[PDB]
Write a protein that binds this DNA or RNA. Sequence first.
RNA 1: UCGAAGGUGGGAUCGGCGAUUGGGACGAAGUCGUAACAAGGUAGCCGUACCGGAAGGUGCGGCUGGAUC
RNA 2: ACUGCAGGGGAGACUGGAAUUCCUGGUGUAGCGGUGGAAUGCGCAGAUAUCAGGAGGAACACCGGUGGCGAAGGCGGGUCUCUGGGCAGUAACUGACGCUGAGGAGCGAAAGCGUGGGGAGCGAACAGGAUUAGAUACCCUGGUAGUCCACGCCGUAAACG
RNA 3: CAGCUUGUUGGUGGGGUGACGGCCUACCAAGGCGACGACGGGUAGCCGGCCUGAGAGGGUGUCCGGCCACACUGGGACUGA
RNA 4: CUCGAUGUCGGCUCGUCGCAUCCUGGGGCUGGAGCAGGUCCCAAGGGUUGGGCUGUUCGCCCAUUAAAGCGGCACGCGAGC
RNA 5: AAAUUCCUUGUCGGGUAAGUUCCGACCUGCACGAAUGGCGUAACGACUUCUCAACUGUCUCAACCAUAGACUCGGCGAAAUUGCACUACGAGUAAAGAUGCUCGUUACGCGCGGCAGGACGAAAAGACCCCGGGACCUUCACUACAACUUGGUAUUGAUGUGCAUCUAACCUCGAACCCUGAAUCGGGUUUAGGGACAGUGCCUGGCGGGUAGUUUAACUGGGGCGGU
RNA 6: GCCAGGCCAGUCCGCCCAGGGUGAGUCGGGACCUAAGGCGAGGCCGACAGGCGUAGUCGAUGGACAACGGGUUGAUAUUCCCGUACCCGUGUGUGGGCGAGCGAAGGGGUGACGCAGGAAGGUAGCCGUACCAGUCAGUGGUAACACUGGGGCAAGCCGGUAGGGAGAGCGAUAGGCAAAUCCGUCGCUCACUAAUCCUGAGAGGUGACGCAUAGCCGGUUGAGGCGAAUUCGGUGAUCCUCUGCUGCCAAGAAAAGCCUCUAGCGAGCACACACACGGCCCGUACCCCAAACCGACACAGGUGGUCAGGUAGAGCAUACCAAGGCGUACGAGAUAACUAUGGUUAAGGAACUCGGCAAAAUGCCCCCGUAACUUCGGGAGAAGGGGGACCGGAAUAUCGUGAACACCCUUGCGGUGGGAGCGGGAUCCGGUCGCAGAAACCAGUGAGGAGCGACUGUUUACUAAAAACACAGGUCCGUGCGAAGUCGCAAGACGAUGUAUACGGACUGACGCCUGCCCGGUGCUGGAAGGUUAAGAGG
RNA 7: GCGGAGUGAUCUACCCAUGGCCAGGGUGAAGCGCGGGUAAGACCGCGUGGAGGCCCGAACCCACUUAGGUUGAAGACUGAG
RNA 8: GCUGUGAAUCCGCCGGGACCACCCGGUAAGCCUAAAUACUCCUCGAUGACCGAUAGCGGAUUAGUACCGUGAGGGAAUGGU
Lengths: 272, 44
Amino acid sequence: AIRKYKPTTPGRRGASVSDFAEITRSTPEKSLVRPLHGRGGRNAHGRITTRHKGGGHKRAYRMIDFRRNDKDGVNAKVAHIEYDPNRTARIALLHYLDGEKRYIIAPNGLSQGDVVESGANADIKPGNNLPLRNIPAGTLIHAVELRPGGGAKLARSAGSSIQLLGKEASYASLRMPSGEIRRVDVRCRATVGEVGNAEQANINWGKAGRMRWKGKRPSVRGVVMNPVDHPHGGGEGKTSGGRHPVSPWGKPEGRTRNANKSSNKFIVRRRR
Amino acid sequence: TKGKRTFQPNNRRRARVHGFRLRMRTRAGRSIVSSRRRKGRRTL
RNA sequence: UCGAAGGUGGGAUCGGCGAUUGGGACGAAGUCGUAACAAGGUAGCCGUACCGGAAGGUGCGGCUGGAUC
RNA sequence: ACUGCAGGGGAGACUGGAAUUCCUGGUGUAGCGGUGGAAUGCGCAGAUAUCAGGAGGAACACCGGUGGCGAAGGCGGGUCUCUGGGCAGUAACUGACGCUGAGGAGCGAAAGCGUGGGGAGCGAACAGGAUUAGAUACCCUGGUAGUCCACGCCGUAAACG
RNA sequence: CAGCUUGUUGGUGGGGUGACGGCCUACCAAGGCGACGACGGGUAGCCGGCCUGAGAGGGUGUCCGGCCACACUGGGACUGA
RNA sequence: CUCGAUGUCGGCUCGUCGCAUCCUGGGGCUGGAGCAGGUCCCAAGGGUUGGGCUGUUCGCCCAUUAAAGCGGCACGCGAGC
RNA sequence: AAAUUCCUUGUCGGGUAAGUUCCGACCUGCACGAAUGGCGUAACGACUUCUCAACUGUCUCAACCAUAGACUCGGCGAAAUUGCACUACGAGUAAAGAUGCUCGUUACGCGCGGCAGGACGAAAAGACCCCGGGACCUUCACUACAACUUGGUAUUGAUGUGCAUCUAACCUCGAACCCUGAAUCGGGUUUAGGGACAGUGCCUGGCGGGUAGUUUAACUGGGGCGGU
RNA sequence: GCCAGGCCAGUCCGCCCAGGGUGAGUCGGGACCUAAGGCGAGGCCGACAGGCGUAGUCGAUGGACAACGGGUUGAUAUUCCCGUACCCGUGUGUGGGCGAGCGAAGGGGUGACGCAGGAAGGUAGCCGUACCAGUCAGUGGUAACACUGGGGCAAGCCGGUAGGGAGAGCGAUAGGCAAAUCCGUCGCUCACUAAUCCUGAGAGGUGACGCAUAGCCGGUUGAGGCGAAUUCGGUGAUCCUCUGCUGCCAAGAAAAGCCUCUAGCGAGCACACACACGGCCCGUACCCCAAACCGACACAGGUGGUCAGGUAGAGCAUACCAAGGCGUACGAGAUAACUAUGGUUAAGGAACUCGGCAAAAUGCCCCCGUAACUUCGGGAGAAGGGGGACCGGAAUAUCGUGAACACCCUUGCGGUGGGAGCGGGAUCCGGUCGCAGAAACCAGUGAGGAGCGACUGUUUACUAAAAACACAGGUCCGUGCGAAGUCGCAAGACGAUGUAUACGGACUGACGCCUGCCCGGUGCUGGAAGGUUAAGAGG
RNA sequence: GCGGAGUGAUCUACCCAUGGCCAGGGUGAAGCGCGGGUAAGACCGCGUGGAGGCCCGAACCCACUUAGGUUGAAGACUGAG
RNA sequence: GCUGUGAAUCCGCCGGGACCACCCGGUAAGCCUAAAUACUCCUCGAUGACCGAUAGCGGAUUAGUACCGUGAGGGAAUGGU
Ligand SMILES: [Mg+2]
Ligand SMILES: [Mg+2]
Ligand SMILES: [Mg+2]
Ligand SMILES: [Mg+2]
Ligand SMILES: [Mg+2]
Ligand SMILES: [Mg+2]
Ligand SMILES: [Mg+2]
Ligand SMILES: [Mg+2]
Ligand SMILES: [Mg+2]
Ligand SMILES: [Mg+2]
Ligand SMILES: [Mg+2]
Ligand SMILES: [Mg+2]
Ligand SMILES: [Mg+2]
Ligand SMILES: [Mg+2]
Ligand SMILES: [Mg+2]
Ligand SMILES: [Mg+2]
Ligand SMILES: [Mg+2]
Ligand SMILES: [Mg+2]
Ligand SMILES: [Mg+2]
Ligand SMILES: [Mg+2]
Ligand SMILES: [Mg+2]
Ligand SMILES: [Mg+2]
Ligand SMILES: [Mg+2]
Ligand SMILES: [Mg+2]
Ligand SMILES: [Mg+2]
Ligand SMILES: [Mg+2]
Ligand SMILES: [Mg+2]
Ligand SMILES: [Mg+2]
Ligand SMILES: [Mg+2]
Ligand SMILES: [Mg+2]
Ligand SMILES: [Mg+2]
Ligand SMILES: [Mg+2]
Ligand SMILES: [Mg+2]
Ligand SMILES: [Mg+2]
Ligand SMILES: [Mg+2]
Ligand SMILES: [Mg+2]
Ligand SMILES: [Mg+2]
Ligand SMILES: [Mg+2]
Ligand SMILES: [Mg+2]
Ligand SMILES: [Mg+2]
Ligand SMILES: [Mg+2]
Ligand SMILES: [Mg+2]
Ligand SMILES: [Mg+2]
Ligand SMILES: [Mg+2]
Ligand SMILES: [Mg+2]
Ligand SMILES: [Mg+2]
Ligand SMILES: [Mg+2]
Ligand SMILES: [Mg+2]
Ligand SMILES: [Mg+2]
Ligand SMILES: [Mg+2]
Ligand SMILES: [Mg+2]
Ligand SMILES: [Mg+2]
Ligand SMILES: [Mg+2]
Ligand SMILES: [Mg+2]
Ligand SMILES: [Mg+2]
Ligand SMILES: [Mg+2]
Ligand SMILES: [Mg+2]
Ligand SMILES: [Mg+2]
Ligand SMILES: [Mg+2]
Ligand SMILES: [Mg+2]
Ligand SMILES: [Mg+2]
Ligand SMILES: [Mg+2]
Ligand SMILES: [Mg+2]
Ligand SMILES: [Mg+2]
Ligand SMILES: [Mg+2]
Ligand SMILES: [Mg+2]
Ligand SMILES: [Mg+2]
Ligand SMILES: [Mg+2]
Ligand SMILES: [Mg+2]
Ligand SMILES: [Mg+2]
Ligand SMILES: [Mg+2]
Ligand SMILES: [Mg+2]
Ligand SMILES: [Mg+2]
Ligand SMILES: [Mg+2]
Ligand SMILES: [Mg+2]
Ligand SMILES: [Mg+2]
Ligand SMILES: [Mg+2]
Ligand SMILES: [Mg+2]
Ligand SMILES: [Mg+2]
Ligand SMILES: [Mg+2]
Ligand SMILES: [Mg+2]
Ligand SMILES: [Mg+2]
Ligand SMILES: [Mg+2]
Ligand SMILES: [Mg+2]
Ligand SMILES: [Mg+2]
Ligand SMILES: [Mg+2]
Ligand SMILES: [Mg+2]
Ligand SMILES: [Mg+2]
Ligand SMILES: [Mg+2]
Ligand SMILES: [Mg+2]
Ligand SMILES: [Mg+2]
Ligand SMILES: [Mg+2]
Ligand SMILES: [Mg+2]
Ligand SMILES: [Mg+2]
Ligand SMILES: [Mg+2]
Ligand SMILES: [Mg+2]
Ligand SMILES: [Mg+2]
Ligand SMILES: [Mg+2]
Ligand SMILES: [Mg+2]
Ligand SMILES: [Mg+2]
Ligand SMILES: [Mg+2]
Ligand SMILES: [Mg+2]
Ligand SMILES: [Mg+2]
Ligand SMILES: [Mg+2]
Ligand SMILES: [Mg+2]
Ligand SMILES: [Mg+2]
Ligand SMILES: [Mg+2]
Ligand SMILES: [Mg+2]
Ligand SMILES: [Mg+2]
Ligand SMILES: [Mg+2]
Ligand SMILES: [Mg+2]
Ligand SMILES: [Mg+2]
Ligand SMILES: [Mg+2]
Ligand SMILES: [Mg+2]
Ligand SMILES: [Mg+2]
Ligand SMILES: [Mg+2]
Ligand SMILES: [Mg+2]
Ligand SMILES: [Mg+2]
Ligand SMILES: [Mg+2]
Ligand SMILES: [Mg+2]
Ligand SMILES: [Mg+2]
Ligand SMILES: [Mg+2]
Ligand SMILES: [Mg+2]
Ligand SMILES: [Mg+2]
Ligand SMILES: [Mg+2]
Ligand SMILES: [Mg+2]
Ligand SMILES: [Mg+2]
Ligand SMILES: [Mg+2]
Ligand SMILES: [Mg+2]
Ligand SMILES: [Mg+2]
Ligand SMILES: [Mg+2]
Ligand SMILES: [Mg+2]
Ligand SMILES: [Mg+2]
Ligand SMILES: [Mg+2]
Ligand SMILES: [Mg+2]
Ligand SMILES: [Mg+2]
Ligand SMILES: [Mg+2]
Ligand SMILES: [Mg+2]
Ligand SMILES: [Mg+2]
Ligand SMILES: [Mg+2]
Ligand SMILES: [Mg+2]
């Protein structure tokens, strides 16, 4: 699924690309597309709050249904599998039998033209969105919501999946692809299956310019900065940074999760 | 940047950056306009 | 026109020497161990991998050209 | 060709239980572990032990054999799907179409290599303990690669009857 | 030493030779050799014979005799059967 | 002395001066037979090479030469490079 | 023997007539070494470095030509600088390098084109150095503070046995509805959760070059180092 | 006008003075639309100041939107005038038709979009040419189609070519906030191998019985008046078909507008033609690789976009020219040194020098040929060679491009052949000339060995372009989601309309082989048995 | 130099939205076809195709070297590369 | 002033410089209140052992003008027959 360019040039020596073999209809569905402009990592203040962003290809936002709440019982047909610049997963254009047009994250094994069910009575097939109550323990799921009706937020990048670990009383315990065991409410809904495009992590971008196309801007190491710019800066030759590694803002490496965050009650075991 | 000087005139940008309405939109700007009236500047 | 010799050039190929370096063989009554031959003192060998001054050690699989019931 | 026959022959998917390890809790207290003897180590912050639940990986006890199958290497938890070979019988068919095979091609234990997963237990390297004159070992305590999976590469074994 | 061959393989019309012949030439087609070893590298004059051996073989090619090649090294014509 | 500035090494260019003389010139002594030298004295008129290495000065080396002198002049000379 | 080797032009070999540079090694590594990566590496380099061919005025060693200036004439017409001035040289002397002082020597007055030795020429109140001040930078200098974090207490309640449960405070960027005509804002209502927790106030410990203000002596045959 | 200014002078002038001059329904903007962003009713947040932001409203560099050709002034012209158009709106008549018709809330569709690359059909332009009109240049020749000039014309409208675009209906309808006959989804019949409809470059007609033009007669050489021919080829776009087609991954605005639906409005309407009218505001002069802009200057600098012909050329290089500009503002002399910019140089050829710095050299097209090494792509234009001009012949169809008179067939911008003239390229053979055939201008030096950095890139504007930075790749750490991190006192925002194959931070820096030992110190992570301890409580 | 309050991104740094521009040569990736090869493939040869922080090279953007300028034509330029 | 806790209504409460007793003084947690005080952009009227055009206002004069700066800002010179 990954096609490697030949070393016809130093920028393509080890480079690779997705063969896009799963994609049909290289254009997006017009009614389902909304505009999107780059921010350069700038917030409302106009200042860089996320470094290393900017440039990058112009993009259009497709609306993905991370809810799948309002069409329980009405069936959908996977009309198309299509590129989406906004995520690493591919997207699936579903035609609902009531005539509604929808985009969803494309799981493994939802080739064009097959049927997706939603609701408590849905079959346990890749792409079917059900409550965790009706999803049995042990199956691989994705696009699972943290709160009932809040929309999918968990395991929705390419190749990601939760497995449902168990359901004791009213909370489903589940292993998050970070390896973290978390409990969510059983009425949180998830779509059955791994997220597709699982092989895109193997893409070797060949050159700097390609990451510039994807919108990443050059990152400068703190150790080649001056002391005024970075705690690691300074030194006559090259140094290791004259101190324990810290961020550009002097923050030491270490746990940054709020130790008294309210979600600790649902987090069962932190990642390894 | 060879040969290009610092002041490249553009009257619309002059007005939108230093203009009367820009001045009047903030207290500092109104303070400046009143200070220039008080000094007696012809141009405000 | 063809033409030997000659000239120019880049290759091919066969040799010599070469600071330095590597192993081999044969030598002596040298130094360090004792790896194999007995269950050789941890059975030994084969391939492979890693490690160790050195023989060697260990892992994985295999063999009996070893054992045990 | 037809009728039968035996089989761990192969591949894929799903799946079962014992056991080890770890986690959560219950009990419970000062040992546990290990050895030729110890120590390193684990525990007293609650270990070992014991009960319940759970996670995960690997291998499939009893059947099991001296046996069966496969060209060899090798092959067994179960089920399903696909699939190769072999043996017997009838004499229906072809009518020497056979044998071998330089080169060549494919398959080829284990180790190893690449990428991506996985990682219980074991365990090269490594580290400590012990033994010892020394101990780069054998023994102990840990333990990384690896062992497992997918796909390639390697193409070697006392690949032996 | 696994790819060697372009006048190379063949044909036509010519030329040329004592004579056939790519021997040479114009044109046309794209063939010829090779694992039975092409092409290449090394070595070598070959033979009846001589030495040895029971023979088959092995070594060798000196006297004699036969054949070939050469004549300081390399290239070319002349006369003349 | 100079900090309200006296530009630092080497090279180049141009020099100029001293003699403690490298050559050429004149001599004494010699452990000067001759050829060559050694040493000292007098002598500054002229001459006193081109390269390799090094930023170099210096130095070593190559090839020469009658000889390949030593020093000063803001370690002469950047309002000359 | 290195972008690292002081000794050092180490030693051996190669390249040159001759090689402190270069290449290959030796290992005696002043002071290499594995992601401040180690060792290699095809391709790439207006990088650094060494060699060869070609080529040439780079050079031996210069010559000539044209043009723009320079020069002359006419027109216009600045500048830095400037204590003066009918501003020699030698040997001296002197704040120790003299146009200006001494003793001599030399020199008719004035222009023009050139040169650049001096006027310690001009230019910038020396960047070096030291002293005083400052700035910024660093940190296990000092003292603070932000941020982060701890507990008490208020917000903050009920029931049982700190623990658990509850819901009503409070919280929700979960959902629906309404203001709303246009609203991914906001607010309200309902619901679904969380929940006396969290957050916040006051008090409090910690941490804190993230930030800030500062200090960091003097003597000294310059300062530093050493010593005092 | 000339006393300042203009680097001199000045009668001149972008200087001084006065007067004059800029004409739009269609051009560029507004009255239309929105992007980024700005402001922002209420609002949320914040001691105050204020921050942010919803509705909304602005905001072109983009979307939509109706005009062309010629003439004229001293100065404006797609603006004035002429000729011919097109767009929006208004009123009045006539004719016949329908009692439908309008629907702009909202829905839906469209609008609507990247990069790269052609090909084909064309066109502009250009080069010739039929034809037309002028000229006879006292030089050796040259009286005609030799030479010189011409060999033109739009928007609009009509017809509709090549090429492209499409299945057509019927029914249901859980979706598009209400509705929908629209859209979406689903289902069924016909045909498909076909016809039909739409769009439709170019070409044709009309515009044009007009305009323009070479030129001619007379002419303060002003202004006039007249005014020919305009055909057929070649070549050929940076333009059109083409918002197409193909390929690719990095996956490529919005809104209005337009169409359609229904909600709604509706007793009157739609439509045609004729006439008569209304079309607003702002800009419009002049300068624009500049003497009028940014550089204090009439300053060797900078300044976005459009057009941009000929010959040679691959070319928008270059050389010389066209159209069109200009000689641009100190001059005149003069063989000084010297400086600068160029040029040439015997013999030698790096001996120069820190260093081949600079210069020289190489240089083009085609054909041969091309090493170590390699990551199999490269290295490579490796290196190293050969040919190159003109003339003639091959050469009537040599060849390949484009495709006319006159013959044949489903009647057409149609087809079969046919080959004229017009261009292109290559070869071979012969000859000719020079010192030289790449002709001038233009236009790679090459090879070998190290170090560093893999590479393209980036950097100290104004002494450093590198070995520095970045980079793809690697690893570690953080982060379970208004995440972590960051900006903010907060609200809020970015992160991200992302969700661990993700995001942030750190170090390393393609790729290959690898990455050993140490957890003592200091950090970080986890643990909580005990010691220590603040406020609080206590008293 | 320190503080308070303001002014500046018409230069420059980065980013955002929306436009524009890049003569002419060259190389020849994927893919796609045909053929060979075997049973089928691998794979190979031809075409086609036109990729690439690809090559040469104008505009354009830079600023490596060098000479000139250095009271400049210019407070950073010019010539040649 | 903020945080916590949190009264009492005269046989109360507050002050008298920790605090206690006595004594003295006063009635917090509501508001309003002239005059004497401060100031002069501006209007009149005077004044000066004040200035007299480089002074006096920056400004006798185009004066916050010209000019400089993107901007905030800076900011002249010039009188006499
Ligand atoms: Mg703002
Ligand atoms: Mg980043
Ligand atoms: Mg730095
Ligand atoms: Mg900074
Ligand atoms: Mg710091
Ligand atoms: Mg540093
Ligand atoms: Mg260092
Ligand atoms: Mg040797
Ligand atoms: Mg032994
Ligand atoms: Mg052994
Ligand atoms: Mg032993
Ligand atoms: Mg043994
Ligand atoms: Mg072994
Ligand atoms: Mg071992
Ligand atoms: Mg074994
Ligand atoms: Mg089987
Ligand atoms: Mg179990
Ligand atoms: Mg575990
Ligand atoms: Mg336990
Ligand atoms: Mg247990
Ligand atoms: Mg038969
Ligand atoms: Mg064989
Ligand atoms: Mg195999
Ligand atoms: Mg294995
Ligand atoms: Mg592996
Ligand atoms: Mg390994
Ligand atoms: Mg792995
Ligand atoms: Mg062990
Ligand atoms: Mg050990
Ligand atoms: Mg498998
Ligand atoms: Mg073998
Ligand atoms: Mg075996
Ligand atoms: Mg022939
Ligand atoms: Mg013949
Ligand atoms: Mg014949
Ligand atoms: Mg011989
Ligand atoms: Mg015999
Ligand atoms: Mg013979
Ligand atoms: Mg003989
Ligand atoms: Mg002889
Ligand atoms: Mg004869
Ligand atoms: Mg002075
Ligand atoms: Mg003397
Ligand atoms: Mg003598
Ligand atoms: Mg002399
Ligand atoms: Mg004399
Ligand atoms: Mg040399
Ligand atoms: Mg001298
Ligand atoms: Mg000197
Ligand atoms: Mg000297
Ligand atoms: Mg000097
Ligand atoms: Mg001097
Ligand atoms: Mg070196
Ligand atoms: Mg050395
Ligand atoms: Mg070396
Ligand atoms: Mg390290
Ligand atoms: Mg490195
Ligand atoms: Mg570069
Ligand atoms: Mg001259
Ligand atoms: Mg003069
Ligand atoms: Mg004099
Ligand atoms: Mg003197
Ligand atoms: Mg004197
Ligand atoms: Mg005097
Ligand atoms: Mg003079
Ligand atoms: Mg001087
Ligand atoms: Mg001076
Ligand atoms: Mg000073
Ligand atoms: Mg610290
Ligand atoms: Mg707290
Ligand atoms: Mg609190
Ligand atoms: Mg500080
Ligand atoms: Mg202070
Ligand atoms: Mg001191
Ligand atoms: Mg001292
Ligand atoms: Mg005048
Ligand atoms: Mg004048
Ligand atoms: Mg408001
Ligand atoms: Mg706002
Ligand atoms: Mg807005
Ligand atoms: Mg607007
Ligand atoms: Mg616009
Ligand atoms: Mg005009
Ligand atoms: Mg008209
Ligand atoms: Mg779109
Ligand atoms: Mg074409
Ligand atoms: Mg004549
Ligand atoms: Mg003509
Ligand atoms: Mg429909
Ligand atoms: Mg037409
Ligand atoms: Mg044409
Ligand atoms: Mg005009
Ligand atoms: Mg100007
Ligand atoms: Mg000028
Ligand atoms: Mg100019
Ligand atoms: Mg040109
Ligand atoms: Mg002149
Ligand atoms: Mg010469
Ligand atoms: Mg010569
Ligand atoms: Mg030479
Ligand atoms: Mg030299
Ligand atoms: Mg040389
Ligand atoms: Mg020299
Ligand atoms: Mg050069
Ligand atoms: Mg040159
Ligand atoms: Mg090379
Ligand atoms: Mg070449
Ligand atoms: Mg010809
Ligand atoms: Mg010829
Ligand atoms: Mg000749
Ligand atoms: Mg680089
Ligand atoms: Mg390049
Ligand atoms: Mg610089
Ligand atoms: Mg530079
Ligand atoms: Mg990275
Ligand atoms: Mg991670
Ligand atoms: Mg946060
Ligand atoms: Mg780190
Ligand atoms: Mg680095
Ligand atoms: Mg390490
Ligand atoms: Mg520790
Ligand atoms: Mg300040
Ligand atoms: Mg501002
Ligand atoms: Mg800007
Ligand atoms: Mg701006
Ligand atoms: Mg091209
Ligand atoms: Mg291809
Ligand atoms: Mg490129
Ligand atoms: Mg252009
Ligand atoms: Mg430009
Ligand atoms: Mg730059
Ligand atoms: Mg220079
Ligand atoms: Mg240039
Ligand atoms: Mg009261
Ligand atoms: Mg009162
Ligand atoms: Mg009051
Ligand atoms: Mg009062
Ligand atoms: Mg008063
Ligand atoms: Mg008054
Ligand atoms: Mg005054
Ligand atoms: Mg101004």
